[PDB]
XYZ file of C-alpha atoms in Angstrom:
476
model
C -22.570 -15.079 3.319
C -25.399 -12.666 2.418
C -25.011 -9.155 3.864
C -22.135 -6.700 4.013
C -21.771 -7.477 7.775
C -21.278 -11.167 6.890
C -18.400 -10.335 4.513
C -16.808 -8.124 7.134
C -17.005 -10.979 9.632
C -14.976 -13.220 7.329
C -12.388 -10.488 6.861
C -12.207 -9.875 10.635
C -11.679 -13.624 11.157
C -8.876 -13.644 8.556
C -7.180 -10.735 10.355
C -7.472 -12.543 13.715
C -6.055 -15.714 12.181
C -3.093 -13.790 10.695
C -2.246 -12.148 14.026
C -3.160 -14.713 16.640
C -2.332 -18.185 15.321
C 0.473 -20.068 17.064
C 2.751 -22.630 15.468
C 4.032 -23.691 18.901
C 4.776 -21.000 21.401
C 7.928 -20.152 19.359
C 5.725 -18.619 16.623
C 2.929 -16.302 17.816
C 1.160 -15.360 14.582
C 2.446 -12.991 11.894
C 4.698 -11.242 14.390
C 6.832 -14.378 14.471
C 8.026 -13.497 10.963
C 8.801 -9.897 12.084
C 10.865 -11.360 14.928
C 12.666 -13.786 12.590
C 13.423 -10.837 10.324
C 15.287 -8.975 13.046
C 17.055 -12.057 14.400
C 18.421 -12.451 10.863
C 19.996 -8.960 10.846
C 23.057 -7.110 12.049
C 21.654 -5.511 15.181
C 20.164 -8.272 17.345
C 21.909 -10.893 19.502
C 19.808 -13.878 20.643
C 20.380 -15.562 23.980
C 20.089 -19.334 24.503
C 16.459 -19.400 25.537
C 13.523 -20.946 23.729
C 12.423 -19.313 20.507
C 14.667 -17.582 17.994
C 18.266 -18.692 18.613
C 18.359 -20.769 15.386
C 17.080 -17.699 13.436
C 19.997 -15.647 14.784
C 22.248 -18.473 13.469
C 20.522 -18.429 10.029
C 19.532 -22.095 10.290
C 15.749 -21.733 11.075
C 14.235 -20.368 7.849
C 16.634 -22.059 5.368
C 15.963 -25.162 7.480
C 12.203 -24.960 6.797
C 11.343 -24.858 10.510
C 8.067 -23.820 12.137
C 8.429 -20.065 11.345
C 8.828 -20.879 7.657
C 5.834 -23.182 7.760
C 3.608 -20.701 9.539
C 4.516 -17.987 7.024
C 3.190 -20.029 4.127
C 0.028 -21.150 5.927
C -0.925 -17.713 7.241
C -0.260 -15.978 3.909
C -2.375 -18.385 1.843
C -5.201 -19.066 4.288
C -5.762 -15.311 4.786
C -5.433 -14.626 1.054
C -8.183 -17.221 0.661
C -10.373 -15.313 3.156
C -9.797 -12.098 1.170
C -10.694 -13.944 -2.067
C -13.882 -15.400 -0.509
C -14.923 -11.855 0.449
C -14.031 -10.561 -3.028
C -16.056 -13.402 -4.671
C -19.199 -12.484 -2.679
C -19.019 -8.729 -1.822
C -20.754 -7.442 -4.976
C -23.839 -9.507 -4.143
C -23.877 -8.515 -0.418
C -27.078 -6.791 0.850
C -26.201 -3.350 2.247
C -25.074 0.060 1.035
C -22.882 0.576 -2.011
C -20.559 2.570 0.276
C -20.084 -0.493 2.497
C -19.649 -2.823 -0.457
C -16.907 -0.566 -1.894
C -15.113 -0.090 1.424
C -15.215 -3.790 2.362
C -13.985 -4.760 -1.131
C -11.146 -2.252 -0.691
C -10.211 -3.629 2.684
C -10.093 -7.219 1.281
C -7.874 -6.076 -1.602
C -5.552 -4.107 0.731
C -5.084 -7.112 3.066
C -4.518 -9.370 0.074
C -1.988 -6.875 -1.304
C -0.210 -6.779 2.067
C 0.121 -10.578 2.069
C 1.531 -10.589 -1.518
C 4.003 -7.901 -0.314
C 5.113 -10.364 2.384
C 5.647 -13.089 -0.218
C 7.442 -10.781 -2.672
C 9.795 -9.251 -0.081
C 10.841 -12.497 1.733
C 10.725 -15.391 -0.817
C 13.008 -13.998 -3.541
C 16.121 -11.859 -3.817
C 15.698 -8.167 -4.762
C 13.613 -7.321 -7.814
C 16.720 -5.777 -9.455
C 18.886 -8.813 -8.644
C 16.689 -11.169 -10.732
C 13.240 -9.739 -11.737
C 12.098 -12.990 -13.310
C 13.129 -15.200 -10.365
C 10.605 -17.588 -8.906
C 8.572 -16.256 -5.963
C 5.141 -17.779 -5.152
C 1.773 -18.696 -6.741
C -0.842 -15.964 -7.129
C -4.490 -16.706 -6.423
C -7.221 -14.155 -6.983
C -10.236 -16.523 -6.679
C -11.292 -18.488 -3.547
C -9.176 -21.596 -2.904
C -10.630 -22.667 -10.661
C -9.399 -25.889 -12.413
C -5.894 -24.301 -12.704
C -5.788 -24.023 -8.836
C -6.744 -27.700 -7.863
C -3.998 -29.229 -9.932
C -1.224 -26.836 -8.962
C -0.769 -23.214 -10.083
C 2.827 -22.344 -11.178
C 4.631 -19.848 -9.001
C 4.831 -16.289 -10.434
C 8.047 -14.242 -10.459
C 9.135 -11.698 -7.886
C 8.281 -8.858 -10.325
C 4.811 -10.351 -10.875
C 4.105 -10.762 -7.148
C 5.236 -7.184 -6.481
C 2.958 -5.997 -9.353
C 0.032 -7.973 -7.865
C 0.582 -6.371 -4.446
C 0.765 -2.850 -5.856
C -2.253 -3.402 -8.119
C -4.408 -4.730 -5.260
C -3.415 -1.783 -3.073
C -4.033 0.813 -5.857
C -7.489 -0.720 -6.411
C -8.110 -0.487 -2.635
C -7.010 3.140 -2.596
C -9.734 4.055 -5.114
C -12.402 2.065 -3.236
C -11.863 3.277 0.345
C -12.979 6.917 0.547
C -10.834 9.493 2.393
C -13.961 10.195 4.410
C -14.256 6.605 5.770
C -13.664 6.642 9.555
C -12.195 3.405 10.929
C -12.769 2.734 14.632
C -9.678 0.707 15.506
C -5.972 0.686 14.660
C -5.975 -2.773 12.996
C -8.659 -1.674 10.492
C -7.534 -0.522 7.051
C -8.559 3.007 6.005
C -7.268 5.350 3.280
C -4.179 6.275 5.339
C -3.284 2.621 5.984
C -3.571 1.884 2.238
C -1.286 4.845 1.382
C 1.249 3.570 3.900
C 1.298 -0.054 2.702
C 1.429 1.258 -0.913
C 4.411 3.447 0.017
C 6.224 0.438 1.433
C 5.319 -1.860 -1.475
C 6.336 0.663 -4.079
C 9.640 1.290 -2.344
C 10.445 -2.426 -2.178
C 9.451 -2.841 -5.843
C 11.787 0.074 -6.833
C 8.831 2.170 -8.076
C 10.389 5.331 -6.671
C 7.978 7.862 -8.253
C 4.980 5.952 -6.864
C 6.605 5.533 -3.408
C 7.214 9.284 -3.298
C 3.654 10.061 -4.490
C 1.878 7.873 -1.988
C 4.138 8.746 1.003
C 3.823 12.484 0.206
C -0.036 12.064 0.271
C 0.186 10.227 3.612
C 2.439 12.838 5.214
C 0.129 15.653 3.968
C -2.627 13.987 6.057
C -0.548 12.710 9.010
C 3.036 13.762 9.868
C 2.962 13.109 13.615
C 6.128 11.937 15.304
C 5.826 10.739 18.908
C 7.375 12.448 21.894
C 10.230 11.147 24.013
C 7.827 10.037 26.799
C 5.720 8.153 24.208
C 8.816 6.492 22.671
C 9.867 5.340 26.167
C 6.394 4.015 27.075
C 7.094 0.419 25.978
C 5.902 0.135 22.296
C 2.889 -1.805 23.609
C -0.336 0.196 22.869
C -2.172 0.956 19.624
C -3.411 4.167 21.293
C -0.074 5.840 20.301
C -0.726 8.596 17.691
C 2.309 7.621 15.618
C 1.012 4.071 15.096
C -0.794 3.946 11.769
C -1.481 0.234 12.009
C -1.311 -2.269 14.774
C -2.931 -5.212 16.553
C -4.516 -4.651 20.007
C -4.380 -7.198 22.835
C -6.853 -7.977 25.590
C -7.489 -10.878 27.940
C -9.911 -12.264 25.277
C -7.429 -11.832 22.428
C -3.958 -12.384 23.888
C -1.967 -14.851 21.768
C 0.094 -12.274 19.894
C 1.271 -10.789 23.212
C 3.367 -13.924 23.811
C 6.017 -12.453 21.506
C 6.821 -9.868 24.202
C 8.428 -12.798 26.026
C 11.133 -12.513 23.291
C 11.149 -8.712 22.798
C 10.960 -7.582 26.444
C 14.459 -7.967 27.863
C 13.858 -5.753 30.901
C 10.557 -6.546 32.712
C 10.755 -9.035 35.602
C 8.455 -11.836 34.461
C 9.393 -11.914 30.755
C 9.978 -15.571 30.061
C 12.871 -15.505 27.543
C 14.243 -11.917 27.334
C 16.060 -13.096 24.212
C 16.107 -10.205 21.656
C 19.183 -8.486 22.976
C 21.166 -5.765 21.305
C 24.502 -5.826 19.439
C 26.565 -3.660 21.764
C 28.026 -1.968 18.670
C 24.498 -0.855 17.632
C 24.558 1.706 20.473
C 27.561 3.379 18.780
C 25.368 4.245 15.782
C 23.672 6.909 17.962
C 24.960 10.355 18.851
C 24.897 11.479 22.485
C 21.727 13.568 22.892
C 19.605 11.098 20.887
C 17.168 9.773 23.454
C 17.075 6.355 21.788
C 20.714 5.851 22.857
C 19.555 6.106 26.538
C 17.275 3.081 25.998
C 20.294 0.815 25.272
C 22.097 -0.373 28.400
C 23.822 -3.350 30.026
C 21.762 -5.390 32.424
C 21.561 -8.831 33.900
C 18.637 -11.134 32.908
C 15.365 -9.657 34.208
C 14.319 -11.463 37.387
C 17.697 -13.257 37.923
C 19.726 -12.706 41.063
C 22.210 -9.959 40.069
C 25.088 -11.408 42.185
C 24.603 -14.982 40.764
C 24.705 -13.781 37.073
C 28.010 -14.092 35.135
C 27.011 -11.897 32.168
C 25.341 -8.690 31.240
C 23.782 -8.361 27.772
C 22.848 -5.098 26.050
C 19.125 -4.513 26.522
C 16.691 -2.254 24.754
C 13.913 -0.798 26.976
C 11.993 -0.162 23.677
C 9.513 -3.071 23.940
C 7.900 -3.879 27.281
C 4.791 -5.765 28.311
C 1.892 -3.398 28.966
C 0.332 -5.721 31.554
C 2.961 -8.173 32.841
C 0.650 -10.160 35.175
C -1.848 -10.821 32.338
C 0.850 -10.872 29.641
C -0.527 -8.236 27.268
C 1.249 -6.014 24.761
C 0.059 -4.651 21.429
C 1.852 -5.378 18.156
C 2.993 -2.423 16.011
C 2.803 -2.966 12.223
C 3.344 0.553 10.751
C 4.324 3.956 12.171
C 4.582 7.443 10.703
C 8.373 7.408 11.210
C 8.645 4.627 8.597
C 6.717 6.846 6.138
C 9.234 9.679 6.656
C 12.017 7.166 5.943
C 10.266 5.711 2.837
C 9.679 9.252 1.531
C 13.372 10.088 2.123
C 14.627 6.957 0.387
C 12.337 7.251 -2.651
C 13.415 10.871 -3.018
C 17.166 9.885 -2.772
C 16.647 7.490 -5.714
C 14.876 10.249 -7.644
C 17.604 12.804 -6.811
C 14.997 15.000 -5.147
C 16.779 17.371 -2.693
C 13.880 17.116 -0.230
C 15.127 13.643 0.832
C 17.481 15.122 3.385
C 14.754 17.246 4.975
C 12.535 14.241 5.718
C 15.523 12.389 7.148
C 16.442 15.422 9.270
C 12.819 15.814 10.519
C 13.023 12.290 12.021
C 16.543 12.871 13.341
C 15.493 16.164 14.989
C 12.456 14.514 16.586
C 14.715 11.931 18.266
C 17.589 14.263 19.269
C 19.981 12.869 16.653
C 22.511 15.076 14.878
C 21.132 16.430 11.595
C 22.965 16.023 8.294
C 24.475 19.339 7.157
C 26.683 18.165 4.329
C 25.611 17.083 0.841
C 26.166 13.394 0.346
C 26.420 11.434 -2.895
C 23.180 9.599 -3.731
C 24.884 6.369 -2.573
C 26.074 7.846 0.785
C 22.619 9.431 1.353
C 21.013 6.048 0.762
C 23.389 4.411 3.240
C 22.616 7.146 5.810
C 18.882 6.509 5.306
C 19.381 2.733 5.651
C 21.300 3.323 8.920
C 18.502 5.508 10.288
C 16.018 2.702 9.407
C 18.089 0.269 11.556
C 18.227 2.831 14.354
C 14.554 3.900 14.337
C 12.921 0.567 13.392
C 15.042 -1.780 15.561
C 13.030 -4.800 16.572
C 9.975 -3.933 14.432
C 10.600 -6.512 11.704
C 12.617 -4.901 8.906
C 16.272 -5.995 9.252
C 16.209 -8.986 6.850
C 13.773 -7.220 4.513
C 16.272 -4.402 4.064
C 19.235 -6.811 3.687
C 17.341 -8.587 0.868
C 15.930 -5.567 -1.008
C 19.141 -3.504 -0.827
C 21.476 -6.466 -1.648
C 23.390 -5.759 1.522
C 25.321 -8.093 3.761
C 24.727 -8.940 7.402
C 27.579 -7.479 9.470
C 28.499 -8.792 12.947
C 31.591 -7.952 14.936
C 32.851 -9.656 18.101
C 32.515 -7.683 21.386
C 35.034 -8.262 24.191
C 33.965 -10.093 27.348
C 35.362 -7.526 29.800
C 34.534 -7.789 32.669
C 33.217 -4.289 33.270
C 31.740 -2.516 36.272
C 27.975 -2.975 36.181
C 25.905 -0.312 38.024
C 22.281 -1.125 38.982
C 19.544 -0.469 41.595
C 17.706 -2.854 44.076
C 19.316 2.002 45.959
C 22.433 1.442 43.820
C 25.332 -1.111 43.889
C 28.275 -2.126 41.629
C 29.591 -5.578 40.556
C 32.048 -6.947 37.942
C 30.265 -8.698 35.018
C 31.269 -10.165 31.650
C 29.782 -8.460 28.569
C 28.037 -10.450 25.804
C 27.829 -9.319 22.182
C 27.126 -11.216 18.950
C 27.518 -14.994 18.911
C 27.056 -16.060 15.274
C 29.642 -14.550 12.964
C 29.143 -16.573 9.753
C 26.571 -18.750 8.040
C 25.959 -22.338 9.238
C 28.224 -23.850 6.552
C 31.031 -21.437 7.634
C 30.502 -19.248 4.590
C 31.307 -15.604 5.256
C 28.283 -13.335 5.329
C 27.655 -11.918 1.868
C 24.868 -10.320 -0.147
C 22.217 -12.469 -1.768
C 22.793 -15.599 0.332
C 20.478 -18.606 0.266
C 20.368 -18.217 4.047
C 18.349 -14.980 3.737
C 15.263 -16.318 1.935
C 12.008 -17.800 3.148
C 11.245 -21.036 1.261
C 8.268 -22.646 -0.390
C 7.276 -25.548 1.908
C 7.993 -29.217 1.363
C 4.220 -29.871 1.358
C 3.688 -27.357 -1.439
C 6.501 -28.949 -3.516
C 4.714 -32.280 -3.263
C 1.160 -31.131 -3.722
C 1.703 -28.547 -6.473
C 2.979 -30.490 -9.457
C 3.278 -27.342 -11.594
C 5.033 -25.133 -9.027
C 8.262 -24.487 -11.000
C 6.825 -24.753 -14.489
C 7.207 -21.072 -15.471
C 10.112 -20.058 -13.177
C 12.610 -22.630 -11.976
C 13.591 -23.321 -8.398
C 16.812 -21.452 -7.587
C 19.910 -23.526 -8.384
C 21.513 -22.459 -5.115
C 19.366 -25.114 -3.334
C 20.939 -28.585 -3.341
C 17.996 -30.101 -1.394
């Protein structure tokens, strides 16, 4: 520590650690939680390969497996990096501009990590606002911290996230020019604020910040761009994302789960609920990206089943196993803006929804819906547009919805493919896990939806549940 550059180096290292750190090959950095989040939803069917099958079953996170462990470690180690920067940035030799901007970036990253904790470790803020969530640290690794700090409530962790991000917004000037898509600038702060405020049910704020963002950047990608594999930060609709190169390639390993179509993908495991394709109108080009296929690389004649694949995510460089990781796109901001406006009874909600629908070739809404039916229509468009990008469980939790999974028949059907085209009879595979592990029917607000404070933390932090008790739904 000593100069502004030195503080930035610590922050850059924190970012790298968040994105790149394995906990086994099953968990490639922060994206592992995004993948878990979709496996724990209504729209994704996992195959039997290594990785996320237990997540699809709802046993992995409740079971405190490696994904759950990595979540806790990444969140708190990177928060500690942000706090080390924040403890030292005011003394850093450099320009006041750089001190402000670096301080803002540290606060924004810290706020993002508290948003992760708030949105995954407790039920919705309006289900129980005082429910236990997670400890809040704002100083690097005091006396209150060494003996344990009590966990704060879900409302308090949301408030911490929003406050950090609002402080960042003031500190990072609109004129600051970032040079890479993983770096946080004014637009990135507005976007994370929009998300955080939506999840916290601060509708007026969510509207305010997403309106500001869309006034600066309202780009929606073309059909060719949408079909290009969701694997490059160069895309103009990506507000935030993590690039991959031969030197920095750990995060790319998660394309072995997400890519169900490229020959050479190792696990091709994030397959589609066949019923998800029925959510799309003919003419919507996203519907074209959903199709039956045999496992990529397998002999087509030897294969008993087809699964529903999404061409959405593909490796950029399959030989060198590279693909970039999307974290935030403009389409999400249109959807946040629409949803906040629906809660506020602002008629403009439907226009933002229809802008996204139009861009994708989907049928526009031309009837007035009740606020509740408009919200459900918005939530459906989130599932359709954001499939595979890490939101399914987050929406289930914050909206107090239930996972829904219907059985698809086995067929067989006539499968058409190319080597030159041929046809063969194949069995069709849909969802596999239709209830929770203890045979409970899927319902809102299940214990099986939440990430859990680790066993290690329960031992080490003797004050963890002092202010807010551990949820009584846990029997172990």
